[PDB]
Amino acid sequence: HMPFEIVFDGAKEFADLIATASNLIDEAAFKITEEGVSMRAMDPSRVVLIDLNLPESIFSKYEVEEPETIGINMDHFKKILKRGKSKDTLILRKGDENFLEITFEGTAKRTFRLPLIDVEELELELPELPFTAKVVLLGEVLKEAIKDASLVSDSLKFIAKEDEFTMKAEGETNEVEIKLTLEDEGLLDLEVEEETRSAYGISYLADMVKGIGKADEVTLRFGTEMPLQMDYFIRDEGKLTFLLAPRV
Amino acid sequence: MPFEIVFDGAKEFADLIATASNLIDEAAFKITEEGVSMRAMDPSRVVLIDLNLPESIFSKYEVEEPETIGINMDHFKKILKRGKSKDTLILRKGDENFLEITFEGTAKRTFRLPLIDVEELELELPELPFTAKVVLLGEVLKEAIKDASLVSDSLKFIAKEDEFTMKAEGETNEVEIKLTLEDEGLLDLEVEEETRSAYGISYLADMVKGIGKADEVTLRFGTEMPLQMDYFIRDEGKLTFLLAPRV
Amino acid sequence: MPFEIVFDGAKEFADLIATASNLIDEAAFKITEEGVSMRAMDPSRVVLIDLNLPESIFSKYEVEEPETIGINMDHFKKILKRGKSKDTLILRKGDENFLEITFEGTAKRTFRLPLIDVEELELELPELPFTAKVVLLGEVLKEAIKDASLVSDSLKFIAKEDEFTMKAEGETNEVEIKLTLEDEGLLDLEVEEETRSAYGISYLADMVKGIGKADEVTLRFGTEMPLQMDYFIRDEGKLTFLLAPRV
């Protein structure tokens, strides 16, 4: 568990990214290597897999001596990171001691000490699934569609066809449809091998998109009765990926 | 019975309906060739609301034949709150018994709202012998009601020739909001005799909750008489409340 | 008659009163020809607060009859919270037993706040042998206190000739906020000798809650001595807290 020093310019942006992962998980193992920081975890119900990848290219200083895995209480990490200001420099540092030193450098130098925990790691792979539909859309559209559907139902049907992407929710008497074509502003890309239909739990979807930005380009990949893969990019280079089991 | 009604600016429409739903739970909307109208009373029958949305405020207005639809106002307002400020709002009725509510913006979002039937009533909005008229900024009215609520549950309106006063008093605390024509908040005052009435603050608060700070609000009242309060929507629409006085 | 006091910017006045009401419930305001002063303690007798508002910060200052009035700070603050940023505030004491609080803006809004009897102690604001002086941005002070509260119930203040540190430590967790003159948050540092004291975070949080992020706050303390925290109102007014150290 060697020392390292990792520096990110923009503490609040980093906190927001961590906050998005923390919405679903409580504890996480962070793999720190020379190439970057990665984290893979499942939510407690084992319905969502989260994969975070932060290559060294997004850090203004990146000094890792030997690869190591550190365990982190995500609630306590997020609570500290939330104190970072938008212009703060964030420094994540480890010495010989078994804690993480979290420093915000801005109008003052503020250093927190976060105890490291033991996180027993599951065997988790991010499989390459045969998705038959790909959608790139503005986060604003995706976030509102999930909110719109929650007025109506507990589940949201995703329907991809050659020229239109539809999210549809139906209640006992009440119903909502959110429809995008490439003529629409909210839709950046649509690729459909065959017409694809799946449905997903809104409570999970709401937790996945809560932290996503309204201007972020979110990529969706899914298949008929297959999981939904949802990702967006951090500084174009890092990537947060969710894999969500379909509602059966 | 098809119709199609289009309003540019969904959030503004939501705000307008939100004002009415503060006192109303269910409403019949009369949809004719000339515009949309709605008239309803709060559950205690203390406040009458009248909403008139002429054809001229809609960007597209296509009514086949006049008809009346009943709407649960809380459900309507919940859907309409999903509209964004730059959305186009489309209100469409096919041959079925549901109102199709579409927001067209970055995406096309269509809600289906089931229609209900509403006990329609002997509701007219008569013209009473009001003796005072006050036009004032919504900011002044809203703040005066909030101010008086610190003090009491009733607000006394007092109009004289050159002054309009709203006064409230508790057992020791008191507040007076005074307006003369030299005040930026008072846009017009017409007083044909000294006029004095009092109204319940809980009703007033619900009436002004949705009014904008820069909306121009017209008050008409008489002594121990109802209060008529109205403001205009896109200049041509009109929202009118008639409020029973308090003893 | 006995006095009329006018302050331009009612909301700014409310914010200043609101800071003091965070620690105190009741206060005696002494109105003299020179200005308004107030001195009080929190219920636990841990914090002394001193407010001095010279006549120079008021647009009109007329004290015919000097006197001292007793005010419930919660009621005072509730009324002052109704003032708008552009309102003129008028404090008027008539012959009677109430304070007249008027907001003059788009309208004239007058509240009557009944005066109360406050058992006044003789509170001295002592000269103390402070060995460290720190001038820092309110933003840094307020954040440090918030940071420390994630960790502990008390915050250590450590001043050395070139650095000011606030440190909190829990069972296992720890935070350190460090300032040097190189840092934007530190405006002045004067250290007669190494100085270390600790203070309850719950008190500090209440002291700084109303202070602005842009405000310039002066701290003075000594080893195992009280903390004196002051900031200026319109350059000439001054709000001072004196906080007992913690053991």
UniProtKB/Swiss-Prot annotation, chain A:
Keywords: DNA replication, DNA-binding. One of its GO terms (molecular function) is DNA polymerase processivity factor activity. CDD domains: PCNA. InterPro entries: DNA_clamp_sf (IPR046938), Pr_cel_nuc_antig (IPR000730), Pr_cel_nuc_antig_C (IPR022649), Pr_cel_nuc_antig_CS (IPR022659), Pr_cel_nuc_antig_N (IPR022648). GO terms for biological process: leading strand elongation; regulation of DNA replication. Belongs to the PCNA family. Sliding clamp subunit that acts as a moving platform for DNA processing. Responsible for tethering the catalytic subunit of DNA polymerase and other proteins to DNA during high-speed replication. Homotrimer. The subunits circularize to form a toroid; DNA passes through its center. Replication factor C (RFC) is required to load the toroid on the DNA. This is DNA polymerase sliding clamp. It comes from Thermococcus gammatolerans (strain DSM 15229 / JCM 11827 / EJ3).
From Swiss-Prot, chains B, C:
Gene3D superfamilies: 3.70.10.10. Keywords: DNA replication, DNA-binding. One of its GO terms (molecular function) is DNA polymerase processivity factor activity. It comes from Thermococcus gammatolerans (strain DSM 15229 / JCM 11827 / EJ3). Coiled coil: none annotated. Disulfide bonds: none annotated. Pfam families: PCNA_C, PCNA_N. PANTHER family: PROLIFERATING CELL NUCLEAR ANTIGEN. GO terms for biological process: leading strand elongation; regulation of DNA replication. NCBIfam families: pcna, PRK01115.1-2, PRK01115.1-4. This is DNA polymerase sliding clamp. Belongs to the PCNA family. Sliding clamp subunit that acts as a moving platform for DNA processing. Responsible for tethering the catalytic subunit of DNA polymerase and other proteins to DNA during high-speed replication. InterPro entries: DNA_clamp_sf, Pr_cel_nuc_antig, Pr_cel_nuc_antig_C, Pr_cel_nuc_antig_CS, Pr_cel_nuc_antig_N. Homotrimer. The subunits circularize to form a toroid; DNA passes through its center. Replication factor C (RFC) is required to load the toroid on the DNA. The gene is pcn.
